[PDB]
Structure formats: structure tokens, C-alpha cells
């Protein structure tokens, strides 16, 4: 899970 | 004829449209902005999901800022009068009314003006859908329990 | 005799205004993975606006981040459908  | 009803785009035109995905998951390393690990599963979903749905599919890999708005400036000057709707999808990086090119920013404002009924006479009346996938800042949800 | 040069957009933002959106780098974003089973699914049979509706639920209920780090551990995501759409949109006819 990662952020944009 | 019979009682006619107008509450529903026209979706039979000759073609659907044209759906303009931008795949950004290489920057700059001098904007310092993170790789986007799994957007190309991204990109061949959507280039397929929107095939089935007969629409003239373009990827673009990794656009600088200058690329993505004259690839949305030449789209929206082509003649959609033959196309029932338009689409975008957006992948990259971004926060607050901004998407990320390989190299810097793009208003966001910027990428849609090019549709605007009057600058876009062929797209008048018909749906110009922008599907992005971006952040749009730094909040994070806690959730709540249900 | 004129219409809005602002009408007949719609923005399918993956996330709410100021928040993060979330993207898992083995099986693509919450939110596209999830618009693409929507659209699969149901193209055929719903107006967009509740196919997008869909679309919010699935990310909703179905997606929690995991993370070593406690400040981006545990979070979820609502998309944020945009219309200014003047008419039904069925991706169907006839
Ligand atoms: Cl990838
Ligand atoms: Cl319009």
C-alpha cells in the first residue's frame, strides 16, 4: 500500500 | 411518432469516443517524486475495461507537463461529431486541483478548459468524463468502526 | 439557447478533497481496480452515476491500508464522484  | 423522452445522453453515435488514459510512474529524478509501483496494472485494466466498452482507447506512458497539455490540446481539437462522449484517466501524482507530469505540475483546470462547450464545439451536449486516479493532499481517513 | 461551458463534465476523483488516495503497488489503486469490476459488471445494466455509487462502496468497505508506519497504517479511502452532467449516462443503447 502507498500514497499518490 | 409516439411520446419522446430526452432525460438520457445520445450513446449511439457511429463511435463511443475516445478514451485518453496518461500513465505517469517514472519522474524526474529531479522533482523527487516516488515511482508508481502497480499503475501499469492500472493502465492495462482500464485500456481493457474501456475497449469492451467500444471505446477508441490511447495510452500515454510517463508525459511530461508539456506533453499532456498539448496531447489534450490536439485531442480536443480533433472533431468528436461522430463520437457519443469523451474520456480521460489521469494516473500520476498530485494533490489539490494538480496532476504531475514526468517533470512538474499540471493544473488540473488547465487539462479540462481544453473540453469547455465553447472550445470544444464538437463535445457540446455530451458527457466529458475525468476519471483520476491522484492524491489530492495529504489527509489520511482513521475510519470509524461500524 | 445556451448552455454552461462548464456543463456536461464529470470528474471520478479517486479520493475526497485533501486526502491521500491509495495505490497498492502489486494489484493497482483502490480505486481503479474497483471502477474497472464496477464497469465490467455492471455497464450493461446501470445509469454511470450509480455504477460510480458502486464504485465508492467497494473502496469503502472493501480497503484498509497496511503499513510498518503507524501514520499510514489502518486508513481507508472514500472516492468523490463530480457531475455536472444534465443527463443520464448509459454507456448502452437502444
Ligand atoms: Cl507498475
Ligand atoms: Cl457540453
Not at chain 2, 465553447?118 to 489527509?139: N, V, Y
Not at chain 3, 455497464?43 to 499510514?72: G, P, Q, W
Request: proline share 2%.
Amino acid at each position: 500500500d502507498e500514497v499518490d | 411518432s409516439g411520446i419522446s423522452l430526452d432525460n438520457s445522453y445520445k450513446m449511439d453515435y457511429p463511435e463511443m469516443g475516445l478514451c485518453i488514459i496518461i500513465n505517469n510512474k517514472n519522474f524526474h529524478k529531479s522533482t523527487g517524486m516516488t515511482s508508481r509501483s502497480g499503475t501499469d496494472v492500472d493502465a492495462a485494466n482500464l485500456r481493457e475495461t474501456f475497449r469492451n466498452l467500444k471505446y477508441e482507447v490511447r495510452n500515454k506512458n510517463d508525459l511530461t507537463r508539456e506533453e499532456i497539455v498539448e496531447l489534450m490540446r490536439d485531442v480536443s481539437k480533433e472533431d468528436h461529431s461522430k463520437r457519443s462522449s469523451f474520456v480521460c484517466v489521469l494516473l500520476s501524482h498530485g494533490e489539490e486541483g494538480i496532476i504531475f507530469g514526468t517533470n512538474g505540475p499540471v493544473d488540473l483546470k488547465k487539462i479540462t478548459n481544453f473540453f469547455r462547450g465553447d472550445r470544444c464545439r464538437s463535445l457540446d451536449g455530451k458527457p466529458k468524463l475525468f476519471i483520476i486516479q491522484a492524491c489530492r493532499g495529504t489527509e489520511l481517513d482513521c475510519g470509524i468502526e461500524t | 439557447h445556451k448552455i454552461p461551458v462548464e456543463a456536461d463534465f464529470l470528474y471520478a476523483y479517486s479520493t475526497a478533497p485533501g486526502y491521500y488516495s491509495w495505490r497498492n503497488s502489486k494489484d493497482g489503486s483502490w480505486f481503479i481496480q474497483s471502477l474497472c469490476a464496477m464497469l465490467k459488471q455492471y455497464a450493461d445494466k446501470l445509469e454511470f452515476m450509480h455504477i460510480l455509487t458502486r464504485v465508492n462502496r467497494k473502496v469503502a468497505t472493501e480497503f484498509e491500508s497496511f503499513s510498518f508506519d503507524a501514520t499510514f497504517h489502518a486508513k481507508k479511502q472514500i472516492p468523490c464522484i463530480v457531475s455536472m452532467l444534465t443527463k443520464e449516462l448509459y454507456f448502452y443503447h437502444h
